[PDB]
Amino acid sequence: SKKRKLVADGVFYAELNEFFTRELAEEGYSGVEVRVTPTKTEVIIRATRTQDVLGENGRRINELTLLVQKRFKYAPGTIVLYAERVQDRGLSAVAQAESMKFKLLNGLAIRRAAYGVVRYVMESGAKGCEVVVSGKLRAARAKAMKFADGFLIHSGQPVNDFIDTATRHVLMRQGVLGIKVKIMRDPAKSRTGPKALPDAVTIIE
């Protein structure tokens, strides 16, 4: 049918997104764009650095394409992968969450990592960032620390319009740590959709 077909296309997108989240975590993966064309289906891996996804002259991208085709039962040639460096990758909540998780995993102070990602996001044009680290930040009481710079909206449609959130589970020797990264991009540099807050009025003389 068509309702089931579109639902299955969304499910396929979710499968691809989580597969690439697990596989390309070290690669700074940000998000797939699936573009079904009559000749072929093309999946573009948006990553902060798109040289490890390609690997040795396309070895890694070729093996990822082969895995995707073999898993989703495509025909040889019908599906093709690409890889795009993310423009202003300091505004990608998934990328920032992955970077902070990597820092916490390889060993670094929670406050240091959270403020590092906050500073990077704020200096890359963002109008606000918030990093929440929940869990056993110390021995056994599992508190939650918040690190925020700039402004941040919570209620309405502009939260969907310009707010990017990402949640990651960090695996250290005492329980899990929940990292939440929230980035509010500047609506003026939107390039798509509404360019200002709904309540913002700009007058000219």
Binding site: K2, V34, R35, T37, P38
Partner: peptide, 12 residues
């Protein structure tokens, strides 16, 4: 006309 409309998201 089938090869001019490849906008991402529309099934044709």
């Amino acid at each position: 006309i089938t090869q001019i409309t490849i906008e991402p998201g529309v099934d044709v």
